[PDB]
Each structure stands twice: as C-alpha cells, then as structure tokens.
Amino acid sequence: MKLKTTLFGNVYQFKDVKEVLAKANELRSGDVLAGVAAASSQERVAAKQVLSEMTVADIRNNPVIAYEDDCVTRLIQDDVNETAYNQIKNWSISELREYVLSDETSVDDIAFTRKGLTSEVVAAVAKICSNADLIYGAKKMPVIKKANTTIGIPGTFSARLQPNDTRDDVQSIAAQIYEGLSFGVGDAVIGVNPVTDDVENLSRVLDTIYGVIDKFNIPTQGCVLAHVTTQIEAIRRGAPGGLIFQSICGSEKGLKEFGVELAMLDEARAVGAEFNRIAGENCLYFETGQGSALSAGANFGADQVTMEARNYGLARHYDPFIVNTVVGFIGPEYLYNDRQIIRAGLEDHFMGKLSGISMGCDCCYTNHADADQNLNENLMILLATAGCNYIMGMPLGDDIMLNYQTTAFHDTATVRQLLNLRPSPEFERWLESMGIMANGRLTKRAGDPSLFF
Amino acid sequence: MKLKTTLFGNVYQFKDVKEVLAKANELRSGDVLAGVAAASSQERVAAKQVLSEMTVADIRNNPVIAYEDDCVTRLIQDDVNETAYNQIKNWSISELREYVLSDETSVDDIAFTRKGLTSEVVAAVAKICSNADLIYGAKKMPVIKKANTTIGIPGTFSARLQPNDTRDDVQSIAAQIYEGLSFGVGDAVIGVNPVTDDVENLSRVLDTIYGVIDKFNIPTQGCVLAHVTTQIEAIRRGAPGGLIFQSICGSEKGLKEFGVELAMLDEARAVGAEFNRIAGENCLYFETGQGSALSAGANFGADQVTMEARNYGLARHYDPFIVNTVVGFIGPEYLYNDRQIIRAGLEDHFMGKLSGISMGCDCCYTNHADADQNLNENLMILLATAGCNYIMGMPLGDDIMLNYQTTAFHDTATVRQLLNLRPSPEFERWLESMGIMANGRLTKRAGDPSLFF
Amino acid sequence: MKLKTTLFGNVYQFKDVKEVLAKANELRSGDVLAGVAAASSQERVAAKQVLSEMTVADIRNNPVIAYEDDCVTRLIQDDVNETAYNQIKNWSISELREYVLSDETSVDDIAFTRKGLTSEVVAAVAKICSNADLIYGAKKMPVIKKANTTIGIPGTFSARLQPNDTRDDVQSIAAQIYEGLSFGVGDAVIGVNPVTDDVENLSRVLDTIYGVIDKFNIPTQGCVLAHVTTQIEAIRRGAPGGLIFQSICGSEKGLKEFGVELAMLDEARAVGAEFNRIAGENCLYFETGQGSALSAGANFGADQVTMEARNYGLARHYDPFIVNTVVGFIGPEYLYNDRQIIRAGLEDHFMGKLSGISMGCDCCYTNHADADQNLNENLMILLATAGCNYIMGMPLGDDIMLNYQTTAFHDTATVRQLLNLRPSPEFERWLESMGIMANGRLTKRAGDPSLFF
Amino acid sequence: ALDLGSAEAKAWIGVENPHRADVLTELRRSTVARVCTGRAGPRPRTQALLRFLADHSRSKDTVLKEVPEEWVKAQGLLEVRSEISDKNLYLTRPDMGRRLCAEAVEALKAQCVANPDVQVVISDGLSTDAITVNYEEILPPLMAGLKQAGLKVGTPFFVRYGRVKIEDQIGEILGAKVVILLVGERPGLGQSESLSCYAVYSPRMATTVEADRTCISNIHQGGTPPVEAAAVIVDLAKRMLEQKASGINMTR
C-alpha cells in the first residue's frame, strides 16, 4: 500500500494506516484534542484519497489495536466470514463505497458482503462519504430485530420512552410513561437510568414500568440502565426482565474503564434466555458514542470515529435488539457544535447499519456545547430519512437528572407524520386500540396522559 | 398592545413592533450587521414572548415601511381579504402559530386564513417556530402551480436545470442540459443566467434550450435569467418564451436598486399571455434571499427575515409558477455558517408556503462563508421533508460563472429515491419514455448524457 | 377561402363567413326567426362542408362583429395566445374537429391549443359535430375550478341548489335548502334568484343561506342572482360574499341590454378578492343561453350558436368558478322542442369546455315550448356522460317563481348513482359526516329535510 | 498515482457503461463544468467527490489571500484603503468597505487629478488573484485606449478592502464624470481569477442606485480575455460620456 499522495504538487505523506484513518475525518474538536486530526483541509483531503486507495486487506490487517493485545480486536477479527472477506479483500475503499451506494447492490448483497468487513474497514468507508452518502447508504441497509416489538422495518420509526427521575420516584416515572405513551413513544423500550444501582431499587423501578405494561397489555419491553451486573442480579432474584443494557467501548482498556468483562455479556444473553419476558430472539441493548475511548485513555492513538465503529463490531457479536449512539451526550471537548454533532450522528448511524446492527440515535446535546434544541430537530429528521431505527423521548427533551436535552415525545409524532412512517407494527396495533393513533396519526385525544385514567 | 414583559424578574421593553420582530429572530450574521439583533439570549426570548402575545392586528397595522411611502407595502395591504383578516385580527401570534401547526387545520382552512395575513404577520409566525415547526408547518401547506409541468403536488419534488457558462457557449450549455436530463433534473425549468444581457445573445441561449426541448419533446419550459425588460424584448422579437424571470426585493427602495418597476411585472404577465409556450396558467419566476434589502440600504431598520417575507407578499400578487430563495448566495455577512444558512432556508421556505406561493430553495453557499458541500446536502434533505417545491441542479453543484456551489444533479435523484418522491408527473412520463426512470428510480442507463446521442 | 361548394351537381354559394356559420347549424326555430337558417338539408350540409374547409385564420379574422365596433370582440381577440394561434391558423375546421376528438390529443395538448382559438372558431367546430362528437369531445376536455368546493374533476358531478320563493320568504327558502341538501345538492352553489333587487333584501336572503351553511359548517358557497351592481353594494355593506353572479351576452349591444359594463366584472373580481368567503381562487358565476342576443337585437345577423360561443369567450377572461347555459329558459321562439333543446345543450356545453370554462347546464324547458320533464331527464343524462360540471336542483324541478321546470333534487342523485359519479370531494365529505351519503349513494335516511332538526 | 489538481483528474470521465464514450469526451471538452463523472447509485463517484473536496480546500485559501503592498507599490499605483483594517473584518462589514477611511480621502485629494472624464480605480475586493493574474494584461491597454482617442485620464490607484459602492464617494471626491472599478468577485470552486468591472456616470452617494451601474463580469482567460475586456471598457466609457448615463440608462 501507499501512505503517500501528491495534491496540487505538494507531497502528503502519512506514518501508518492509523494516521490516515484519523486525518480523513471531517474536522471535530475530539480529533484535535486527541492530537490526531488533519493540519489543514488539503491534508484532510489527501488523507481521504490515500485511504480511498487502500484495499480492504490493507485496512483489515491493520487494526488500531493489535489482535494479541486487545480482546475486542480478537472478537471483531474472529467473527469475519473469510469466504466473504476473500471476495472483497482486493477492493479499494473507493470501490467499497461505490458498491454500498449502488442501486444495483441489494439488501441481500450487502447481507453477505458485510460479513467480510471489520470495524476499521466500516470506518474507512464512512470517512470518504458525504452527508448525503451516509444518509442514502444507511437507508439501503435496513436491519430488523424483534423483541416484543419489531424494529427496523423500512416505513417504520420507533422510540425509547425515557422516564428518568432525580429520586427514582415511581410517581414521577409513571407520570412520564403515561405522557410518552400518549404521543406514541415506547415501542423500542421503556428505559430508565436509575439513581441507585441497587437490587431493591431496580426491581421497584422495573415493577413500576411493568405495572403500566401489564395493566394496558402493552406490546413493548422495559429496561433499567444500571450496570449489567446489577440488572442480572435483580432479574435472577425475580424482577421482570425485558432488555438487558450495557454501555460499551471499542477497546479492552475501554471496557475495563466501564467495569465490563466480555463474559458479562455472554451471561446477559444466558440470563435473557432463562428469565426475560421477550417473544422474539433479541433482548440486549447497547449504547455507544464518539469520545468514550478517548475519555478513558483507551483510543491508543486512534480517532473517535474508528473507535466508535469498533463498538458496533463488538455489539454485532451479541445480536442486540437495539443499539444507539448517544451522539452529543458528553460535551464540546469531543463534539463542539451543531455541524460536528450532525456529522457524527450520520457517521455513527451509517457505520452501525453497515456493521449490521439495529442502529438508533439519541439525538442530544449538552448545555456547555455550542448547540440548541433546533440541532436535535435538524438531526432527528435527517437520521429518520436515513432509516434510523429509533430515537429517545422525554417530556420536551428535558432530562431532569442526566442533565442534557434529547428529543421530545412531540418529535417522534412529528417525524412519523412528516415522513409517513409508522410505529413498530405490534405497538401501532396497541395505540390504535387505545384510540391514540389512526392511520399513523395522533387522534384528537392523543398527547393527554389523563387518557389512561 | 404591550411592548414589554418580565423574564426572571428582569423587565424587557422594546421601542416598537419593528424592534420586536428584529430581536425575536434566531441569531444571524446579518441582524448583528444591521444593528437590530438581540443583545442576549434572554432578550431574544423576551422579544419572542412579547411578539407571541401581539395580535394579528398589532402586526398588520405596523408594517416595516409605511403605506404612503412604499408601493410594496401598498401592494401587500391592498391584497388582503378583509373578511379573513377580520376573523383572525384578534388572534395572538401564538394562537396563529398553534393554528398553522394543528392537524385539525386542513389545507382548505389555511387557504382562506392565509388571505387575511400580511407578510409581517407571516414573518412574526416564523420567528416563534422551532426548526421542526418550520418543516412540519410548511409540509402541511402545499402550493401547486402549473406551466408545462405541475409543481408542488405532495409526494413530488422538482428541480431547476441550471446550465450556466462563462462565455454563454451553446456547446457548454447543451452539454450540461443533457447531463441534467440524464439525472431527471429540469421539471421546474431549464434556466440560464447569461453572461451578456443583450437580445441576440438571449435569443441564442433560448434557441439552445428549446432545441433540446423540441427535439426530445420534453414537457418543461426554458428561461434566461436576464433583466425582465430584456427577456420581454427577446420574446416580442420572436424568441421562445417559457418562464419570465425577475429578482425582487421587499421594499420600493430595494426594487429601485434592482432597476425594477411594478409595471414591468404587469407587462411580463401580459407578454406571457400573448407569446409564451405554456399550457398551464402560471409563467413567472421570481428569486429572493435574505440580505438583499439590507445590502441595498433598503431595510429601513427592519431585519432580513421580515424583509424576505415581504418578497413573498409581493410575488404572491403575480401568481408565479415558481419562487425560490437563493439562501446562501451572498456571503457570510448576512448568514455566517451552516447553522444560520439552514435556519434561513427553513424560514424562507415556511414563509413562502404560508404566503401561498410556489416556494423552492437554491440550497447553496459561498467560499467566503463558513460552509461546505455537506451543508447543502443537510439543508436540501430537510427542505425536501418540508415539501420544498424544487431545488437547483448543476454538475456536482459547481457553478463556473456565478462562483458559488449549489446542489448537484445527483442530489435530486438522491432526494427522490431516499424519500420516495416523484418528479412532476408530466416530466416523469417523459423520463420513463426516455428509459431514464422506472418507478421513480434512475435506470441503469441513467446518469449518462451520451444517451441522448 | 372558398364560400362555395357543389353538392350533387348543384352549386351552393354563400355571401360571407357569417352566412356559412349560420346555415351550418342544425335546424332550430331561432335561426329561422333570425332569418339566417339554411333553406334545406342540402344547403345545411353544403354550408357544413364549406365551413369544414375554411381555416382557423379564415374564421378568426372574420368575427360576427368587428373589433373596433364591439368591446366583446376586442376582449376575445386580445386574449389570444398568438404563439398557439400561429401553430393552428392554417388548419381547416375539419382538421380541428378531428384533432379535438383524437384519443392521441391529451388534456394538456388541448390546454395550449385552445388558447389559439376565438369564439367563432369554437363555434365552427361545434357546427360540424354530431351529438356523439359533442359529448365525447366535451368529455375529454375537463375544466376544474375551486371555490370552497372543487368542481369539474372527472368522476364527479355537482349541483346548484335553487331555493327560489315568490315572496323571498326566508322560511320557504330555508325549507328547500334542507330538502336539497338531503339529496346531496348544493356543492356547486346555493343560489337564489330574489324578487326584490334591494340591499336589505339581498342581505336577508344571503343571511338565510349562510345561516344554514354556518350552522352545519357546509363546504359550499351562497349566491343571490340579482344585478351584479346590487350584489356588490350588499357585499360592500357587510353581507356574506360567496359567488358573484352576472348574466352575460356576446356583444356590446347585448351587454347594454342587460345593463352590464365590462368594468362591473372587473369590480366584481376585486370585491370578491377583498370580501368573499371563498378558499379557492374562483368566485364568479356567469349564466348564458341561446337566443339572448337575438332577443336584444344584438346578434348583428349571426346565428344563436355563434353568439352563445362569444359568451364563453367573454366569460373565460374572468376565470369564473362556474358558467351555465340556461338551455330552454326562454321559449319555443328560439328552441322549439325536445330535439332542438337537447342539441343546443350539447352544443353549449361542448363550446364552453372547448373555451376552457367551468361549463354546466340548466337542463330546463318552459310550458309554452313543445317539451316535458322527460326531456330534462334525457338531457341531464347525456350531458352527465359529457362530463357536464353541474346541473340545477329544485323540489321536483318546479320553480314557483321563474315559471319553468328544471331538474329535481332527485335527478342529481339519479345521475350520480347511475353513472358512479361523486359530489365535489369537499362536499362529499360533509354529506358523509351528516349520514346523507355512503360510497356515493344516498343512505336510507337521505331525502328527508327533517334530518336537519 | 493521480494528483487531484492535475489536468488528468480534470478530464476524467467516470460514466460506467456509456452509450457513446466518444460523445462523453467531446462533452467533457465542451465545458469547464464537472460533467460526465457518472454516479454510484444516485451519489457522486468517489473520484469526483475527492476532486471537489480538493478544489474546495484551495478555494477557501484564495478568499483570505492578500496582495503584498510591495506588489502594488511596484505597479506604481497609489495604495489607499476603506474603513476596513483587515481581511476578517472585510468579510463581515460590507458597510465599512463601502466607505473611505479618513486618510484615504486626504491622499486622493492631494495626489490624484481633479475632475477627470474617466477614473480607473482598482481593488482586491473578494479575490486578490483576480487582479494579480489579470493586471498587466488589462490595465495598461485600458488606460492606453482612454488617452489614445479620448481625453482627461485620471490617475489610477489601488483601494484595499474595497466594495463596489465605494466608487460613489470616490467619484464625488475627484469629481469624475465616469468612474470605472476593477474588483475581484467572490471566488468560485475551481477558479479565483474572475474579475469584474463596475462603472458609473457621475455617481453620487446619496442618489445613485445599483442599477445606475454597468457591470462587466467574468473577466479572465477562461471567460472574457483581459486584453479584449479592456477594449470593451474603453468603448463603454466613451458611450457613458456621450450619453451622460450608465447601466440601466444607456441606449440599446
């Protein structure tokens, strides 16, 4: 391979594949902080061309962290279909981009081809895509999973109901659930980040969620987003199991930062299969987001996009029901503004779909970043046209306890009625019987939690 | 009428309606330049609330430039259906916003209500809309016109083929036409900004466009975007008349700057009716964009959003086939970056639709602005979801003579296939008979201008 | 041009285009009275052949009344698209007939071609059409307009509710409105010919009509068919404006007979636009009928068909929501029997559609003509298959005050259910919600005015 | 081993299974526009995107690029400036680049001829390259034409950070019957050489509007050649002095 190109008569040389992959990124505050970003637009473009010219082999054989050094690298590499890899290993990344985007490449074509990819190769493709490339490419790569709802079917759009409370007060939690359900939110999951990471508390929250599910016979699933170890404890001890959640990171060191062993995810699958109230075969929920590895000093000189792609590669091993990036969850140090957050969301979603996972996005931002609610509205609509599997919902997007702004319950109804998309078909049935939705639209009496009393 | 409120215990008072309209705007480059922007975030919110509390009557009765002093104000005021106005004059702008957005407000409801607005009221409404408000509100207000194609039908999406050349070289112009047609661009118009504004040259450029239309029997229309007087001349003297074009401004002073008298637009309509090769009843084409008035010293202390909306009140009087903003055509001084250009595009489009015109957008930026091609792709997709009637198309979006970047031919095909939207129905039929489109998608043979040879 | 043919060896010469146009008519009592009719069937046919051989130019340049002598001639001629005229001016009338009737001539084709016609040319075509030609030709020329209802869409059939009372008694008027609405009549208009032509009375009638419209929120419009001057007075003075009505005539002298200035129609458009409760852009209502010019001594030697065509040419200038001929309204002196009245109705409707106006027909007759109710039933069904825009309705067809018989409320339901046609889509929605109509058919509880109490 | 700025990169035809590839070469030659690059589904081919992005990097650089005062001093031109002090402020304050700074006025009154028939004024405006690349070729023959068949030729000078409307103040201070302005227009994606001329008969700040100007845009080797443009400007000038009018007040 070449690590060198000339552009307008000036030679642009790079040290290694890693450097090329980093500098090819669109500018973000994260890559600058990590000190891996291009020096100018010229060198950004030169890196893109060098990358576009490397083969699948070139990139597959040069992972950011070495096989024998990193359990996540080993997981990713060990999961390759070597027959699919052998068909494409001599393709340039340029050629792989064009393949993904081609109207003559079908869903079934991509289904086999994607098995010959590693996360690094997935990343390389994302790096040479425009914003429209990322949206259109992602849209022609649907990924459908099933718990008690079916998510990911083209023409549909799901949503997590996020009824968080600063005190985990079951009244406040319930209040927001009735509100979200009235806007048709919750077909992805009813998921709470709890305050105490504690068996008694987890079951109490879970009991709260499932009290509403069981009372109205809602086709959905509940989740409490504490450490995977504590959710497993609670479910083993009798609490209702829906989805089992873990945050992940794309290196072994990253996982250690989070207190996560791979064997915990094995165990979560096993517990799911013994205990969980799930009809379909998918029951895991992962969450990701650009900058985690960097925060943990676990990026090993790699840009945050390449690292984020490694998360999806890890996730794919466990066939989760849903994954989402929490796109602007941390702050300006990794993603500074509107511009950069939109790009990252489009990148994250496209890479997730290319990796063949059930990829959603928490379109969100924080109050110390250069961002506002109009950003979340721009981004949610773009991602929806990309076939984004699901977004979040809270009352007006205000999390009273995680201290950021995500999408409103309003925003899911907006997206759905704007783009003629429907909920998960099972959930849509339930909304119709409750008189909340007719022909994909909120009825006159929707958006009113007192409807449930 | 209250020109004051209290936010967090602080009293916010404004001089007049005009100040309220200015300081309610989301932050942009041009407002700061005009000296009319908010001093802080709180004051912007306070201006928004004060404005939301004003009545339709409050705003209608305080145009930005006086009736007696401004022929554009007169035109807008004299066009009001006073019976519709009387129904709504006691509504607050907040109640009008909520009415526009309501799913119980139909297209026919809005049909009558909008006749009671003036542009200042249109603008007021826009100022208290979030980005998703502007998109969803615009989408539920379709505006449909008909030349040789029908434009604006929900579920369709049209494009201007902009085959501009540095020398007006008929070979270069023809080359770009064939290329654009191969991507399904040109259902809005095939429209050239010429280098020389003389009759012989205008006739030659028209002869070039119509040579192609006539040879392949394309259902569409041509246009040469010179001064309206010169077009009229050419057409009277025998050139093929399609659409008649004029750039406009929202004040009488601004029109003077442009060299345009209202009588010229009357005449253009008369000339269209006697000469033009148009089946339907619409044949005018206007172009607008935020900053034009301010540049012309013709905003009289009003902001660029309020002034832009007045462009639409003017245009509506002449029932044009199409109108578009050229959203980022000028430079960073009026709209600085991605964020500001997107917002402006959503505003302009929402305001045009609310004014009842056939509103499209040239999603574009300049090289001295903090913007890139990813911006055009973000905005074009958002505007498509909003039911934007049309965008532009140039090869890769690079205009070799107007020195800016607009959308590529690729972008229209992308938008159509991403959102399952169709061209104008008459043009779609033509594309299918050419073997260029099947079921709304580019065939294998598409995208190759050599197909016409 | 030739004004001469030989037929079975006998030379048939004619004086001028006017003579040819008159004698080409199918026999009617009117042309005999006017003294312009053929002397035999042979000379009728010879005139038809001579006419069929003249060009569009021949006829366009020879109007029944000269440009400088007649304001209606000037209106008609000044409205020609000279580019469309230049394409067809060398066609024979034979060739224009065949063009109109061709299955390869589309609605869009006719849309442009019709702009190159004058009323005289429209007449010439009608004169060489059989009854089936007139029906099929008219059917392939839809003309769609919109007030608060949409009229003219193929597959639909509208109706004027005509609740006239000898004393303008608001109870009698209201009684017939509830009756008509119960049969699904009124989507065209609720139109009253009043007894007193007087502001207080007009507003009282209008108040009556709109009381029913406003109470049941009916998507329609009301009208009082007094002189246009008095309707304008009343509407200016605060009465509800729906459609503004004027009877018209195809010469300047004819208009003088009726006390109509062209500037009154200009003013009615302007008043409509300031005052009227109309969502769409059409608000005028014209009425015509063979023999008016003759009655007024204003035919200037022209047959009544050619004169009637000049009415449509006048009407087209003002883009009315609806026009109808009042086919048998006057008496046997102009149209003697069944035969002649059917022919005239088919002629009037075809010419109206060819002129590009929203053409309906009052299928009616008088008690001194050789005619009965079975005539109205024959004619209404034929015209309905022709795509006639609307007919009238009164209780059983008996006007208690204009002293003639039009169509029953029954007849609109009959036509609709016979031919699988629907009401204006907006009105159909309203009938469905009232439980009057289901799938285009009157429900069990329709035809009962007490349904409204 | 492709340089994206190379002539080869520019002439690249990317249509996959073209109906008539010989036509595509002909078409690509017809135009400087980015035709015949083909597609991947509905999206641009990778190479076309890459060159676009490469050109864009170069374009941005030309926006902020300034002429040395060493270069203008060597042109023997007087240098003056608007109220603007730098490139960053120029981009954000149009109102300031439309006004002379208070020492500009005093330099012009002390160093330029009063009341000329024709005044040439030169500014970098939005693209330095437009005047640097074009200058030796347009400027001399222009002011040759004006004296060679003509009359009172004013003394030419450079306005830094200028915008077109600054020529109205200039015409008032010098009492010019005609003012002609060569100014860089905003840079395009692939080109920054494009020069325009904005000319007015007897302008006044308080009265003259934009339509009172005649524009001649797209001056450069790839549009209207500088030598040739200079002759059309000389012609225009003398027609303005004859007609006592410019732009939208000039016959045919």
Ligand code: B12
């Ligand atoms: C930007 C721009 C505008 C802006 C205004 C200027 C601005 N940018 O702030 C807006 C969007 C208002 C605009 C409007 C119109 N413009 Co303009 N404009 C341009 C453009 C793209 C840039 C010029 C530039 O950068 N100048 C250099 C900078 C440094 O000067 P500035 O002080 O910042 O800007 C001044 C000039 O741009 C001037 N100007 C801009 N356009 C025109 C047109 C004419 C005829 C005149 C006399 C002056 C003029 O107005 C500004 C003063 O505030 C050129 C295309 C090009 N290749 O240059 C077309 C261009 C100059 N405009 C053109 C035209 C015709 C128009 C319009 C008449 C409508 C139309 N048909 O498009 C209107 C009204 C023009 C007028 N009489 O004022 C033509 C001029 C042809 C000619 N020789 O007569 C051009 C050349 C493009 C084209 N090929 O059609 N335009």
Ligand code: NA
């Ligand atoms: Na359990």
Ligand code: NA
């Ligand atoms: Na960090």
Ligand code: NA
């Ligand atoms: Na005044």
Ligand code: NA
């Ligand atoms: Na009234």
Ligand code: NA
């Ligand atoms: Na008579």
Ligand code: NA
């Ligand atoms: Na330039």
Ligand code: NA
């Ligand atoms: Na030029």
